[PDB]
Structure formats: structure tokens, C-alpha cells
């Protein structure tokens, strides 16, 4: 089983979506969840450290999800940190670019709690958690 | 006789007919309470015994302790079968 | 636009009893509910045709019965959740509008060609979108109320709108059994869906009414039919059984019963006559015309 | 006989039936206080003895000191079992 | 209505008959596994509905969710009844 | 064989029952036109074949040229006989 | 209300029955550790509630904080009672 | 074995009790729709199995294909017999 | 039996006709049906891939059925993709041209569901499906 004290960073431009994701994570047993409004704030909070999983939106102001993922992978201290990508449009080119950047998973809005739980379980199994 | 007992294990109904006669519907309509209808059978002749409407024997009327009864007299055989057929 | 499976492909008879299951489930088919849903479907299709100036195609899905938590787990988020009341039944009903259907309706109402679908970003619905949802919900509630009239006249009243299932609180426990009826709506090349979920406890008093597939009756024709049926049944025969008394004993004493053994029994003041084990009257026993006879005293009312 | 005593240790109910008859519901509705219903069993025949509704023996009515009693006469056996089955 | 309720508190058995036919016992003995017996009723005709062996209505065969069912069509009525009797 | 022929010269009625069920009279009164009644027999099971109300065999429903038919499958057999009597 | 209070000052025992079934003693002897016995009641149906062995209501099983509980659903009523009796 | 078969040809009723508890009549009157009553038996303990009201074994609740079932676990045994009688 | 998950592309200039064809396919057991308004949109959706059968109208704006069939056959990845041609006028010259282009079948408006089912069964039998 995955560690229930794992710290999650939810990054999205909409506060309501972040609250929904936090509630879904709480229903799954994860209570250590922090929220970020854009890529810059997400990177600033990542520089603090202590996070074990990232859920980030694709299109965000001042930094999109792809650039944030590239910056995370470029950092040695956070290159192995799993990142979950949530988007509104599942274009093949964007998915391929994210996979080349090192995305751990992909979620398409709208989605159900079952899909999110399945994605989290698959990511944890791939990482051996 | 196994199949014989098998079929015997079925309840059946026996019918005794007092007599038979033929009349027109007009005469039937002329019948009221107290009307008299004659039968083709002579008084005292054995009455027809029927199983599910099939005549198989003849019998005579007796009274048993307070109940009517039929005394078996004679059965049928193709001879009587044909005989009654012709009759 | 890759589906979830395509994205994954590219990236890569004895059961224990759990008392937390509320096993009061209806294994019988709710035909009447199916007829109501079909009628509701048609009445709404019309309403949507009137509102959107386009011809909609509404398909009624299977009426799946499942616990509330499973229903909540399969609801896409974010979504438009509307709480309704089905008077005089007790409880709160849910009318679920998917964001795709809301976006399609907004497109049709505001001159959208339909060639540019709007992708759900997870944002809250705007006030104009809220008013559109309002209008759609009013039409749906009117259609539902009209559909329910033929079987049981019910008044449908809207309560409030929510965006998350946790705020609905329509069931006491997450394991409670609810009845959900999915609907698929097709408008041009755009497809939308909406769901009507009703807790089973709300419709539990109407269980028998919902069971059989009923309709087309009468008041005088049915009266004559019932009268003649009652007349016909009166000629049926029954086996009247009268019990002399009852003796409490043990099986060992039965094995020791032999010819001549006398068993003491309490003398009954009255004899109870039973039809297939059901008592019908009390009487005294006697002999008439050489046969045992019963003199009726009272009829069991 | 240990298991035998084990099962014997259970209280059971014994039922004695005066007789059986068949009638229509209309005739039942025609029954009032003082009405007379005849039974198919002849007067004096042993009455059926039932355990939890299962016929196992026959008995005769006796009066014991101020109480009704049933005198055990004869049990059953598949022969009578089948006999009453056919009966 | 009082007597209606009094008799309503009684269970009764309903019987639906597929059809009726007449044959000899010899023909019955000629029947083996896989043998075919024809019925006097035409295919599709409503089936007889009986209460304790008494015909009171007619119905049609339907399948309900995985179970056979009879759709009530019409009451017996006196004329149809007498006709079946003469049959 | 002589007695076999003697009883062979008799007509009898055969009855096929779709199924049996038990219900209360209140439920019967709740039945109207279009009402649905379930039977205790599973769909597809061979139907009971009765001679004058006596169950002697089981059969399957077939359609013969425009008429319903019963395909003889198996005799009643006596262990099953007692079992059904007990039912 | 006076008599109501007078009888209120009395303790009584309530009994909830999971289900009822009928079996032979031979089958009971065939039961060992781990044996399976089926009940006549369908899974999920409300369980019978008895006071001193007398059925007065029906209820559903719930778990209360670590303890089993029965949720009162409906009173026995006369018709359902007579139905269970005939059962 | 002869007496074993003789008593084997008898139907009996089996009763499974969810649990037992003691309460005052005042508390019973305080019970309404939705009220909660606790039982003295711990959750998960085998339920009492009774024959005609006589406790003879204990079992566990299982679901069989859509029906409740009781899994036979252990016989009553007589030391426990007296102990429960005393309870 | 043909795979019930086979993806169908219905191409017609009339939305009502496309809906009718989709409903007929659903009654036949095929639920994976997509619609195209003209040849250009049909080709664009074909470039996405995943389709196993095509039902296209003859006269469509900006691209007729014959040109769409020729383009499909000219593509190696879709040269073996069966195409069903539905028309309002069954001119012999057009039928011969479509047969030379590689048409898998031909349907003439108006038609019944039985005719469409027969054509689909014949096409599947020819392809060994």
C-alpha cells in the first residue's frame, strides 16, 4: 500500500478544481495535500521540499504543465518525483510531448474518482510503492 | 399387469342413465312444472351404465340402506356392442 | 483526441454476510419505472426541441441499482448536481446534468454552430450558464411530474444546486441502495448525458405499484369484470378441516405408541375449522344422519 | 441411540382431526349459526392422528375422567402410507 | 364486503392447463421417451385457467423476466362454459 | 391382454398443466386485466401430464403444423410420485 | 392508561429470528462442522421479531457502533400473520 | 435404524435466532419506527439454531446465490446446555 | 460473427440521415459509430485512425464519395479499409467508377434495414470477418 502520509501538490488555475482534487485525495486516504495556483507557485513550493506526488493541470498562467514538468525533471533533487497530468483536451501531440518529458500519468477532464484512483494505483505500482 | 395397475390408478366417473327419448324443442317448451315425459325404455328393463359417457354395462335399480344402487347384470362384448349399435 | 485506453496504450454460491450492505434490494424488475422513464424521456425530448430549436435524440439506459457510494464513485467531476423533492414521498432526489450537455445547450441557445466543442476546464458554471441549467431543470421536472401522473401523482420541487457529491447528503449512509436511471442525449453530432438518481427508501412504499407493468384500466368496465370474477370464484371448492384438539408430546412417546394406548387431551369447548391450516370459524361437534356434524357458532372476522 | 435421544429431546405438537370434507365457498357462505355440515368419514371410524400436520396413526375417541382422549389403534407403514395416498 | 374479506383471508391454488386431448390407454403405452402427443387446442389459443380444478377464465402465455406468466384475457362466461362441457 | 382390450374400449381425457402456484385470495382479487402471475415451475421444464386429474407423465410443448403439442419425455415414476404428493 | 402502566411495570424478552426452514432428522445427522444449511427466507428480507415466541413485527439487521441492531420496519398485521401460518 | 426411519418420515421446523436481549416494557413502548435495540450477542458470534424452539446447534450467516444461509459450526453440547438454560 | 466493437464512420451531408444510419447500426449490434459531414472531415477523422468500416454518401460538399474512396485507397494504411457507398441515384457509370475505385458495397436510397444488414453481412463474409 502507498504511504498515507505522502505529500501531494495539486496545481491548477481554478480553485474549485483544486478543492475537488483535494477532496478526492482525502476520500482515497491522503490528507497531506497542498495547492498551487500556477507553475511558478508550484515550483516555489517544490523548492521547499517534502512533496512526494504532483497533480498539475496542463494549461496554467505564466507556466504550462509541460514547462513545469520539464523544470522538475531538469532538477536532480526532483527528477524522480512523479507528476500526474490533468488536461481538458487529450491531443496526441501534447500527450507524446508530456511522455517524452517524463510524465507519470495522464488524466482527461471530466473524470471520475474511480479513474483517478486507478491512475494513482498504476503510478504507485510502477514506482514500487 | 404392471402397466394395467398403472392405468387403473386413475379415478374415473360412472354414469347410470334412466332412459332415452326423442322429442321436438316445441314439445320441450310446452313442458311446465308437473309435465309428464315418457321414456322409450320399458318399465323394469335394466338401465344403461356409462363410463365417461361410454356405455359398458347394464344394471337394475336397488335401494341400499337409504341409498339408490345399481345391480350389475350383464356387460357388452362386440356382439352386444354391435347389437346396441344396430339397436 | 485520444481516449483513456488509447492514452494508456501509448504511454505503456456461498458468500459471507456483511451487515453493512442493507440487503433490502428489489430483485424484481421495475417495469412501471421504465414506462415512466420512457414517458419522461419523450416529454423532455419535446421540451428540448422547443427550447433549443433543434431535434434531440434521448435514449433511456438500463435502470441499474447499486449502492450510493458506487453511484457517487462513477460520477464525473466537476458536474451539475440538482437536489429535488418528490412530494409526498419523503427524501431528496438528484438530477445530474453532465457538463457536456450543459455546454451543448449553451451552444445551441446562443447560436453555436456545434463545430467547436467546449472542453471542460473544471471551472464553476457562470450565472448565465446557471440560468440555462435552471431552465433545463424546470423543463425536466415538468416532464417528470407529467410522466409520474399516470401511475402516482407526484409534485417535483427543486431545492438547491451543488457541484460536488459530498454536499448532496441524500442518503443516510454511503452503503444505502439508490435507483439511478442514466439518459443519453444526442444533438446533431454532439452527445450529452444526464442522470436521475432516486434513493430506494423514497420509492420503497410504492414498491408494489412500481413492480408490475400496468396501465389502461377503467372504472365501470373494471367494476363489471371484478363483479363477474367474484361470482365465478364463489363456485370453487375448498377442503374444510376441523381439528379435534392438540396434544403436546415428544417423539419418544410416539415411538412407544401401541394399539390400545390412551392419550389424555383437554376437552375443547369449541371446535375450530381450518381451511388449508387457516381457521375460518368455531363450532360445536355433533352427529347428524349417521355422520359427524359441526354446528357453527361464530365466523372468524 | 445417542443421536436418537438427542432428536427425541425436542417438544412436538400432536393433532387429531375429526374428519375431512370438501365444499364450495358459496356453501360456506350459506352457513350460519346452527348450520349443519356433514363429514366424509363414517361415524365411529378411527380419527386421523397428525404430528405437525403429518398423518402417522389413527385413534378412537375416549373420555378420561372429564377429558377427551384418543386411543391408539393402528400406525401406518408404506402400505397404509400408499393406501391412504391412493385412498 | 364483510363476507368478502372473511373469504379473502383464505389461500387458494390456481391452475393453468396447456390443453386437453383424448387417447386410448394402448396409445399411452405406445408412448416412449421422445414420443409426440397432439392437443385438441389450436396453437396460440388462450389457455384455460382453473381454480381448484374449476375453470373460471382464459389467459395467454407470457415470459416475465425469466418466468412464465399468464395474461388474463376473458372470464369463462356461461355459454363458453357449457360449450367446453359439451366438448 | 383381454382385460387390456376391455378397458381399451373406453375413452378418457388427458390434461396438460402449464404450472402450479400458490397465492392468497386477496392477491387474486388484486388481479385485473393485464395482471401478471408467476408460476413455480422454471421456464423450459417439462409440463405435467394428467389423466382425469392424475399425474402420470411429463412432456414438452411443441407446435404441430398450426397446433400445440406435447412431446412425451418421461413417466412420472413413484419416488417422484410421493415427492410431488408431499409438495 | 392505568392498566397500560400496570403492565408497563413488567420486563419481557424480545426475540429476532434469522429465518426458518424444514429438514429431516437424517439430514440433521448428516450435518458436521462446516456444513451448510439454507433458509427459506430470501437474503435481505426483514427478519421476524418475536415477543416470548409471538411474532409481532419485522425488522432489518443493522450494526450499531460495534453491536447488531434491528431496524423496526412494519407490524405483523393479520393477513401477513395468517400467510406465515399457512406457510 | 427402524425407529430412525419411522421418525425420519416426519416434517419438523428449524429456527435460527439472531440474538437475545432483555428490556422493560416501558422501553419497548419507547420504541418507534427507526428505533435501535442492541442484542446481548457479540457481532460475528455463531447464531443459535433451534428445532421447534429447542436449541441444538450453532451456525454462521452466509448468502447463497441470493438467499440467506446458516453454516453449521458446532453442536450445542450439554455443559453449555445447562449454562444457557441458567442464563 | 463480425466484431461488435468495430468502429464505423458514417459520412453524409445530412445530419438526419447520419442519425438514421447510426440507429440502424445500433439495432444491428454496432455501437462504436462516428459521423462526418463531408469528405474533408471524414479524411481528417480517418487520419486519427481506429476505424474499421466506412459508410459514405456519394454527393457531398467539397468532396464527393468517389474522391474520398480514391483518397482512402491511395493511402497504404487505409487501402484495405472497407467502404460502403450509399447514393440517391444508381447510375451505371457511377457504379462502375466506384467499383474500379475499390468500393466494398453499394446501397441505393431509399433502403430498408434488411438491405443494409444483408450488405454488411456480404461485405464481412468477403473480408472473412
Numbering used by the authors:
A (entry chain h), I (entry chain i): 1 to 129
B (entry chain p), D (entry chain o), E (entry chain 0), F (entry chain u), G (entry chain AB), H (entry chain w): 51 to 137
C (entry chain S): 5 to 16, 34 to 322
Paper text:
The bacterial flagellar motor is a huge bidirectional rotary nanomachine that drives rotation of the flagellum for bacterial motility. The cytoplasmic C ring of the flagellar motor functions as the switch complex for the rotational direction switching from counterclockwise to clockwise. The basal body is made up of the LP ring, MS ring, C ring, rod and export apparatus. Here, we present two high-resolution cryo-electron microscopy structures of the C ring-containing flagellar basal body–hook complex from Salmonella Typhimurium, which are in the default counterclockwise state and in a constitutively active CheY mutant-induced clockwise state, respectively.
The C ring-containing basal body–hook complex in the CW state was obtained by incubating the recombinant CheY** protein with the above purified basal body–hook complex in the CCW state. Further local refinement on four protomers with the symmetry-expanded particles improved the density map to a resolution of 4.4 Å. CheY** is bound into an open groove between two adjacent protomers on the surface of the middle subring of the C ring and interacts with FliGM, FliMM and the prior FliMM domain. At the interface with FliM, CheY** interacts with FliMM and the N-terminal loop and the αN helix of FliMN. The α1 helix, L2, L6, L8 and L10 loops of CheY** form an open concave surface to interact with loopα2–β3, loopα3–α4, loopβ5–α5 and α5 of FliMM. The mutated residue D13K of CheY** interacts with the loopα3–α4 of FliMM, while the mutated residue Y106W is located on the α4–β5–α5 surface of CheY** and stacks with the αN helix of FliMN, suggesting that the double mutation activates CheY through generating direct interactions with the C ring. CheY** also contacts with the β2, β6 and β7 strands and the linking loopβ6–β7 of FliMM–1 of the prior protomer via its α1–β2 surface, which enhances the inter-protomer interactions in the middle subring.
